[model samples]
Target: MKFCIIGYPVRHSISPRLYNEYFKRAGMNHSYGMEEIPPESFDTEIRRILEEYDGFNATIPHKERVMRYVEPSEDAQRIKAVNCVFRGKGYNTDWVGVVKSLEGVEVKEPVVVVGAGGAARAVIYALLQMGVKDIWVVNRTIERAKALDFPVKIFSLDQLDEVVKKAKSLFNTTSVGMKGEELPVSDDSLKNLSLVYDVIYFDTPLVVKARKLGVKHIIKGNLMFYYQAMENLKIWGIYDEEVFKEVFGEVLK
Candidate 1:
């Protein structure tokens, strides 16, 4: 089966590498890649892929917009965002995998999520689903963070240190320190973090920075990548409920 993920500036996407790694492990012949397209042309590309290819993952400005193009299941609608688009009917795998991705963290401790984009929303919802309250939102765009409707309260990135002092888990939902861009947070939050998660994966600089600071981390940017790509296997009428562990089971050992 052939599938692809769609996003602007697609070259940077780690979806292809991470999902391909899973495919090799599962010994599946399925293939996946990225379809690069600008925001203006996202609609056209989405239609083309859904009709021509099996299905594709949506990212960035495309995630919310794709909901307008496809018929999403309750799972997709609940997130009020669509990252995984399926054809010929199948469960939307985004949130289940997203919720599953938050494991091993102490949610009882306050959680601080950075960024005001789609990724932040997913993170907030995932944490709330775990019965967490007192989530603090930090973003470069202060107004955007303030306007994040929901139970979450907003703060500036400068608040990173204060949040770290109080919270148990924290991460960047934005693109900072992405691809080794060298965008530094106010302080090295790695030490206070219970699990440092960057939506940008593939052992990026932030992960490395966290490692240097001696923090436990999960490179879950690729969890979103693989979770979205895992839907491709479903489109081909193949199901492996164990796919999550099959992909990351080595962590247990």
Candidate 2:
């Protein structure tokens, strides 16, 4: 089988390495790579992709957009985002990634979610699934945050200081700290938080700040990435936990 991750600005994706490694370890003759389709060409190019790949993953700007092309699972339908697609059906394993990555962390109410994109929707959905009642979404644009359509408090980035005061956890679903030293929230805002989860799969600035502040629980996105990628494999009718674990450990190093 063949698979690939589809996205705009997909050069930075590590999915090809992760999936290919898993395939090699499991002795499966499968290949995976990246398809960098710009937003403009997605509508036209997606038909070819759907026909060529056995299954595929969508990321960033394409997560929400791909929902229009496939039948969404219940989780994907509620989150309104699709990260994994197989057999013309879309599923959201991102929420599973959020839940698995947050294991053993005490995610209290009044959680502050930074960014209002597809990733943010997954985080919010995971929080709701965990019975978190008070979710505060902070985004640069208030309108985009409100479009999430969940029953939660929405705030602009300027109101972060005020919102973080009562929040116990902060989840950053944006790319603010992906490449640079910039953070989604201020350093002072992180000082009061007990848990910080930055879904960027690296030692981003937010993760560094949380570590320095001695936050009770600090999570980078690698584990989330591993779990989500594994879930995507399962959606494609492949499951080998032992091979996945061994390859994931090697990939981390």
Candidate 3:
């Protein structure tokens, strides 16, 4: 088997560690690589890459755009994102990770979602799936937040203080602090939030704020990546969770 993740600057992704380690431990003749294809070459290279490999994962700018190329599943169609592609079909496992990340949290409580991109869509989808009715989406662009089309309140970044105070959970899905240093919103807003879920593995400002505020039920970004990868492997008929977890431990170290 062969697989890879296609994104701009995909070298930052640790997906290769998870799949390569799993393959080695399971003794499967499989390999995974990171393919950094810029936006200009996506159309040109996706077809060629698909033809060469069994399946591939799409990230960042490609997730939503890739839908135009593949046959999307119901979840992918509803979430408006395609994270995993296999056999010419697009499937979204992002919601799976979102759901798993908030495993023990009270889904019905109000939640603040920070972004209006594909990642936020998956987060909202997972929250709605878990019966969360009071969902609020805050974005720098209010129009984009409103365009999400879900039955949720849309607010601008300035309203985060009010939104976070009423929200039990806060999910950061934007690239604001992925590789940068500062947090997107003020630390005062994060004080009331009980849970913080960051989709990026790298430490974000929100991650630090959560720790400083004594938020015990924090979901590290890597857990979401791990769950999403597990679901991705399951799509390819690999269900050995024990083996994956064992290998994941090594990667975490």
Candidate 4:
């Protein structure tokens, strides 16, 4: 099978490395690759590869563009953004993959999310789908939060304390606290946090923070990859357990 993650500057994406590595280690009979399509050519690329490719995940500029390629969506439509493209029939898997990731993960009593980017949208949408109450969103440009069509409580950075007191999980959708690039917020502000999920995973620093503190957290970037691979299987019409096993054999077996 040939699958890809479509985005501009996809070179920074670790998805190909993670998914392809897993495919090999598991002895899965397939290959994974990356496709860098410029914003102007994104629609054409989607049209060009709709059927030829096994499956695909869309990101950044192409997220909004891909909605037109797939059939109408009821679940993905809830996200207000389409980060994953289902090819001929796969967006369902992306929805499942995302919702599946958040199941049973403990957010602190007050679960707070940072940023309002695509990843942020997925995180918040996932939280709501999981039925996490007291969800709050914070961003530098507070207007970005307001720009979101979702009906939830939003706040400024100054409201971190209030958000902390209410949240059980703190999802870091922002690129901050990544790669040792510390932001202005204090970890003490998150003292009540049970988990700190950083969507950025180019380095171990964010994960390292969770590790040193023994917080029950995850790397958002990693979840994004796993969700991609898992949903790709479902989207490609591989409706069997063994297929997943084969796909994950390297890491699971």
Model 1 segments more than 4 A misplaced: 17-31, 88-94, 142-147, 182-190, 216-236, 241-253
Worst 10 residues of 3 by lDDT: 178-187
lDDT of 1 by residue, 160-226 (tens): 7777667767767777765567434534545666677777755677677677877765555666545
**What is every candidate's alpha-carbon RMSD to the true fold?**
3.8, 1.5, 1.9, 3.7
lDDT of 2 by residue, 1-253 (tens): 8899999889878888878888988999999989999999999999999999988999978999999999999889889899999979999999999998787877866799988999999999999989999999889876666668898888888887778877889988988887766653666777878888889888987788789989888888887887787788788988798998888765455
lDDT computed for candidate 3: 0.83
lDDT on C-alpha atoms for all candidate structures:
0.67, 0.86, 0.83, 0.64
TM-score of each: 0.77, 0.95, 0.93, 0.77
lDDT of 4 by residue, 1-253 (tens): 7777888767677667756766666567666677889988876677776776767777665665676777636766666556656545425334355566566655444567777766677777777777766777887785567657775678887776566655667767766765466544455555546777776645445556656666666545555455656666655654345544555534322
Q: Report the lDDT of model 2 for residue 123.
A: 93
As for model 3, its CA RMSD to the true structure in angstroms is 1.9
Give lDDT for model 2. Answer: 0.86
Question: Alpha carbon lDDT of residue 47, candidate 3?
Answer: 81
| Predicted candidate 3 versus true structure: per-residue lDDT over 1-253, tens digit per residue | 7899998879878889878888988988889898999999889888888788888899988898789888999999999999998888999999998888676666536888888988999999988999888888988875566559888888887777778877788888888777665544666767767778787787777787789998757666787787888889999886587898898755344
User: 78 in model 1: Cα distance from truth in Å?
Assistant: 3.4
